[PDB]
Amino acid sequence: RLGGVCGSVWGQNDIAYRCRTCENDPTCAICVPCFQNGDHNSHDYSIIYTGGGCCDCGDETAWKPDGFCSNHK
Amino acid sequence: RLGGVCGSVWGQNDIAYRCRTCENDPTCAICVPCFQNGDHNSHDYSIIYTGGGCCDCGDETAWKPDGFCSNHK
Ligand SMILES: [Zn+2]
Ligand SMILES: [Zn+2]
Numbered sequence: 140r141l142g143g144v145c146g147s148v149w150g151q152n153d154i155a156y157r158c159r160t161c162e163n164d165p166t167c168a169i170c171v172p173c174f175q176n177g178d179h180n181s182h183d184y185s186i187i188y189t190g191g192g193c194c195d196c197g198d199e200t201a202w203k204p205d206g207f208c209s210n211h212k
Numbered sequence: 213r214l215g216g217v218c219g220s221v222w223g224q225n226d227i228a229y230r231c232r233t234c235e236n237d238p239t240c241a242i243c244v245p246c247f248q249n250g251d252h253n254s255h256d257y258s259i260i261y262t263g264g265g266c267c268d269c270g271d272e273t274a275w276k277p278d279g280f281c282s283n284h285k
């Protein structure tokens with residue numbers, strides 16, 4: 140749609156996705172909804188327990204733009 | 213907050229949560245964000261691959277109200 144960082148926040152035991160294909164570094168992650176609304180077919184992703192943090196979807200300094208979901212580009 | 217069913221939709225391989233403590237029946241489920249914004253401490257929950265469907269959070273006919281998240285009550 141016509142045009143934002145997600146920034147959604149995790150608590151200590153909340154799950155999220157690591158995507159090693161899309162991450163800027165190994166400390167980056169995206170929330171489940173952002174994962175599900177993007178294209179990670181064939182990517183090396185895993186479900187992780189975050190230990191807290193915030194979603195990097197839409198932040199080009201933490202996540203590769205081709206890994207953004209449909210709501211954060 | 214002052215006051216809705218979530219209704220968020222899953223694709224075939226999308227994950228969600230089953231909560232056997234909160235479900236109306238074994239076919240009910242809630243989305244990850246709704247799980248994370250509710251209280252399922254001590255509940256018998258699991259991450260599942262949905263096969264598609266929609267989130268039951270906020271629908272008293274599919275999910276026990278004490279299992280609703282903060283955005284759907
Ligand atoms: Zn996100
Ligand atoms: Zn996103």
Ligand SMILES: [Zn+2]
Pocket residue numbers: 158159160161178179182183184206
């Ligand atoms: Zn990816």
Ligand SMILES: [Zn+2]
Pocket residue numbers: 218219220242243244245246267268269
């Ligand atoms: Zn939901």
Ligand SMILES: [Zn+2]
Pocket residue numbers: 218245246269270280281282283284
């Ligand atoms: Zn909810």
Ligand SMILES: [Zn+2]
Pocket residue numbers: 231232233234251252255256257279
């Ligand atoms: Zn529950």
